[PDB]
Design an enzyme around this catalytic site. Structure first.
Site, PDB file in Angstrom:
ATOM      1  N   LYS A  97     -52.954 -25.703   3.796  1.00 41.69           N
ATOM      2  CA  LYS A  97     -52.547 -27.077   4.083  1.00 41.69           C
ATOM      3  C   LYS A  97     -51.765 -27.058   5.396  1.00 41.69           C
ATOM      4  O   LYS A  97     -51.255 -26.004   5.781  1.00 41.69           O
ATOM      5  CB  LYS A  97     -51.679 -27.654   2.953  1.00 41.69           C
ATOM      6  N   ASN A 146     -48.264 -25.258   5.957  1.00 44.52           N
ATOM      7  CA  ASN A 146     -48.146 -23.800   5.939  1.00 44.52           C
ATOM      8  C   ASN A 146     -48.642 -23.129   7.224  1.00 44.52           C
ATOM      9  O   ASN A 146     -48.661 -21.894   7.287  1.00 44.52           O
ATOM     10  CB  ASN A 146     -48.913 -23.222   4.725  1.00 44.52           C
ATOM     11  N   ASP A 160     -46.377 -18.526   3.803  1.00 45.36           N
ATOM     12  CA  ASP A 160     -46.328 -18.849   2.372  1.00 45.36           C
ATOM     13  C   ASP A 160     -47.481 -18.218   1.607  1.00 45.36           C
ATOM     14  O   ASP A 160     -48.545 -18.838   1.469  1.00 45.36           O
ATOM     15  CB  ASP A 160     -46.330 -20.369   2.100  1.00 45.36           C
ATOM     16  N   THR A 209     -51.973 -27.549  -3.674  1.00 46.80           N
ATOM     17  CA  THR A 209     -51.613 -28.958  -3.523  1.00 46.80           C
ATOM     18  C   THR A 209     -52.806 -29.849  -3.883  1.00 46.80           C
ATOM     19  O   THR A 209     -53.959 -29.484  -3.614  1.00 46.80           O
ATOM     20  CB  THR A 209     -51.123 -29.255  -2.088  1.00 46.80           C
ATOM     21  N   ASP A 233     -53.453 -21.610  -0.695  1.00 47.74           N
ATOM     22  CA  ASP A 233     -52.463 -22.638  -0.335  1.00 47.74           C
ATOM     23  C   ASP A 233     -52.694 -23.160   1.091  1.00 47.74           C
ATOM     24  O   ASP A 233     -51.738 -23.487   1.806  1.00 47.74           O
ATOM     25  CB  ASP A 233     -51.028 -22.110  -0.495  1.00 47.74           C
TER      26      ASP A 233
HETATM   27  C1  LIG Z   1     -40.541 -20.690  10.514  1.00 48.84           C
HETATM   28  C2  LIG Z   1     -40.793 -21.123   9.258  1.00 48.84           C
HETATM   29  C3  LIG Z   1     -41.403 -20.188   8.293  1.00 48.84           C
HETATM   30  C4  LIG Z   1     -41.775 -20.596   6.940  1.00 48.84           C
HETATM   31  N1  LIG Z   1     -42.145 -19.753   5.910  1.00 48.84           N
HETATM   32  N2  LIG Z   1     -42.464 -20.471   4.915  1.00 48.84           N
HETATM   33  C5  LIG Z   1     -42.298 -21.758   5.322  1.00 48.84           C
HETATM   34  C6  LIG Z   1     -42.571 -22.954   4.496  1.00 48.84           C
HETATM   35  C7  LIG Z   1     -41.442 -23.970   4.531  1.00 48.84           C
HETATM   36  C8  LIG Z   1     -42.134 -25.317   4.384  1.00 48.84           C
HETATM   37  N3  LIG Z   1     -43.571 -25.114   4.661  1.00 48.84           N
HETATM   38  C9  LIG Z   1     -43.745 -23.725   5.113  1.00 48.84           C
HETATM   39  O1  LIG Z   1     -41.888 -21.892   6.616  1.00 48.84           O
HETATM   40  C10 LIG Z   1     -41.710 -18.837   8.801  1.00 48.84           C
HETATM   41  C11 LIG Z   1     -41.410 -18.501  10.077  1.00 48.84           C
HETATM   42  N4  LIG Z   1     -40.839 -19.409  10.940  1.00 48.84           N
END
Ligand code: A1JEY
Ligand code: A1JEY
Length: 339
Positions: free
Chosen positions: A157, A160, A173, A190, A155
């Site tokens: 991109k 992330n 992610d 994606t 994943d």
């Molecule tokens: C901030 C954010 C995160 C986070 N985890 N997954 C995401 C996905 C949400 C959209 N694209 C990435 O953001 C972790 C730590 N701090």
């Protein structure tokens, strides 16, 4: 390279110990206060929370069990949590707690307040080659680590890749990450970042992560991705043709690296040859990169995000705020026994 061989051997030992005996049930929902929604998706969302006793901030990913089942993501969800609790690398987001209740699955991660690489790239337009190269070197080392553990990430991109308070990357992610010795077959990722062998429904391997690194470097340095089109079917046609046009401002070394990462024949693609990752690390485009200094976080970053403190949400955007409901009755208990 003996020091690299022994580092990776130790890394694999420590991963396997946690892989074979995963931690479970290490916090609960009413230990935290809910602050703001940071992102939303088909079956889950990510919230900023605060731990009530310590005052620490975390990012809490919340998945609706019933919706995971309906979208056929049970296996992928179990993959994500089991891998995240077992890995340890400077550029991977850290999982601090996990737990479940009658309705939901929860993964509680460190909060990275600098925001997604996506936001910064789209605001500035494109990154200079040294700026792109700083981020790319971090992904090269992270994929060297993941692949040595027999993990495929699947994943990559800009959305992330989070930017931390020192300007370094934290990959987030792991919803599509999987432990794979050999080939695997699921259609996921994606559209702009998919390797041709995924689009053609072949059995594929870790070389699809190196294809996606090619897409990412091109997008960081151009401001747009190499196979851009309006609908997925048209993107897929450009990917499988492999014809790529490079902007004139790209350096000759950058074009040569990208032709070897964006190689449609997976048996000829850099990262997937006899010398493995070293064909990438030793390429002319990385000649100025001190690989040890990057790993040790001793390079000054090109860019430090603006934020006011560990609870600042100004680098994330605004979403409708929805309830976190927990049913009086247990849903899908059997399917998620191991979580
Ligand atoms: C901030 C954010 C995160 C986070 N985890 N997954 C995401 C996905 C949400 C959209 N694209 C990435 O953001 C972790 C730590 N701090
Ligand atoms: C087999 C299948 C899967 C799988 N996960 N999601 C899917 C998609 C198929 C229907 N829409 C979701 O297939 C994973 C591993 N082995």
């Amino acid at each position: 390279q003996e020091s690299v061989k022994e580092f990776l051997a130790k890394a694999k030992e420590e991963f396997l110990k946690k892989w074979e005996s995963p931690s479970q049930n290490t916090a609960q929902l009413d230990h935290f206060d809910r602050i703001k929604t940071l992102g939303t998706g088909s079956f889950g969302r990510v919230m900023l929370v605060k731990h009530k006793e310590t005052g620490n901030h975390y990012a809490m990913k919340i998945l609706d069990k019933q919706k995971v089942v309906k979208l056929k993501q049970i296996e992928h969800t179990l993959n994500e949590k089991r891998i995240l609790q077992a890995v340890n690398f400077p550029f991977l987001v850290k999982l601090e707690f996990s737990f479940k209740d009658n309705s939901n699955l929860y993964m509680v991660m460190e909060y990275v307040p600098g925001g997604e690489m996506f936001s910064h790239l789209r605001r500035i337009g494109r990154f200079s080659e040294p700026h792109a190269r700083f981020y790319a070197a971090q992904i090269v080392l992270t994929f060297e680590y993941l692949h040595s553990l027999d993990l495929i990430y699947r994943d990559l991109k800009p959305e992330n890749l989070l930017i931390d308070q020192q300007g370094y990357i934290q990959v987030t992610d792991f919803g599509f990450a999987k432990r794979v010795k050999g080939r695997t077959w699921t259609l996921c990722g994606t559209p702009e970042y998919l390797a041709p062998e995924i689009i053609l429904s072949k059995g594929y391997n870790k070389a699809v992560d190196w294809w996606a690194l090619g897409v990412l470097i091109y997008e960081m340095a151009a401001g747009y991705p190499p196979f851009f089109a309006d609908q997925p079917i048209q993107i897929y046609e450009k990917i499988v043709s492999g014809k790529v046009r490079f902007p004139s401002h790209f350096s000759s070394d950058l074009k040569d690296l990208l032709r070897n990462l964006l190689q449609v024949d997976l048996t000829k693609r850099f990262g997937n040859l006899k010398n493995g990752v070293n064909d990438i690390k030793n390429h002319k485009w990385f000649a100025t990169t001190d690989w040890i200094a990057i790993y040790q976080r001793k390079v000054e970053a090109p860019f430090i995000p603006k934020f006011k403190g560990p609870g600042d949400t100004s680098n994330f955007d605004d979403y409708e705020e929805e309830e976190i409901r927990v049913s009086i009755n247990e849903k899908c208990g059997k399917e998620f026994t191991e979580f």
